[PDB]
């Protein structure tokens, strides 16, 4: 692991790993409004935190809707010259939704009902598969 030599490095498709990716993006995501830069307030982060699980993908424009961001407020780390750039993904929990779609498609999960499996169990499924 280079952090815990006894333990191995593992499992991108993992609640813990996907959540690491998500939190790294969210914590590093800053919005530039015409003028200067600023990072998301704690209420904004709290608002966005659970949306990658609730929706299929948290689109950048979709994030603008959630925050009532109001054009003249643009995302940094986003090529805004390209047209309809805000259809970019910004985050997709591939593993969580892969497990959820598998269960949904076979009759064990009520679609759009949160996956009740534990983070431990999700990590285990990711590592095993």
């Amino acid at each position: 692991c280079t952090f815990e030599p006894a333990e191995p490095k593992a499992a991108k498709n993992t609640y813990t790993a996907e959540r690491f990716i998500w939190l790294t993006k969210l914590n590093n995501l800053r919005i530039l409004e015409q003028g200067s830069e600023r990072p998301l307030t704690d209420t904004e982060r709290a608002t966005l935190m659970d949306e990658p699980y609730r929706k299929s993908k948290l689109t950048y424009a979709q994030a603008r809707k959630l925050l009532g961001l109001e054009d003249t407020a643009f995302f940094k780390g986003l090529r805004y010259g390209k047209d309809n750039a805000e259809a970019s993904t910004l985050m997709e929990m591939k593993a969580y939704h892969a497990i959820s779609r598998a269960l949904e498609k076979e009759g064990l999960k009520d679609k759009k009902s949160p996956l009740n499996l534990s983070p431990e169990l999700q990590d285990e499924i990711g590592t095993a598969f």
Binding site: T47, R54, S56, Q62, K65, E70, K111, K112
Partner: protein, 117 residues
Amino acid sequence: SMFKRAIIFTSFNGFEKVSRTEKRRLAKIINARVSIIDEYLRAKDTNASLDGQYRAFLFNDESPAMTEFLAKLKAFAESCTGISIDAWEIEESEYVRLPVERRDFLAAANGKEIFKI
């Protein structure tokens, strides 16, 4: 005589395509409450008006209309598997004091959560 405002934000969650019929249903639900007083937040059936929109309805506490409306909303949300409704609640005392700039968002953060579905 205390005015609670129910802030409801409607999002399109992707899991399924959204039947034109469901858009008409939700538009009927939302537009039942609207009057010339709040001709803003009139609900169309197009995605642009139903997807990713905050609407703050004014209700009067000690009146059973707020609860019935929110129950109808919750029932539709439970039914529609592909539309997600978020409800909050704020007293108008605090609501009016916010800066108009993005009031509904702020009211959502500063307000009592009701149901997320």
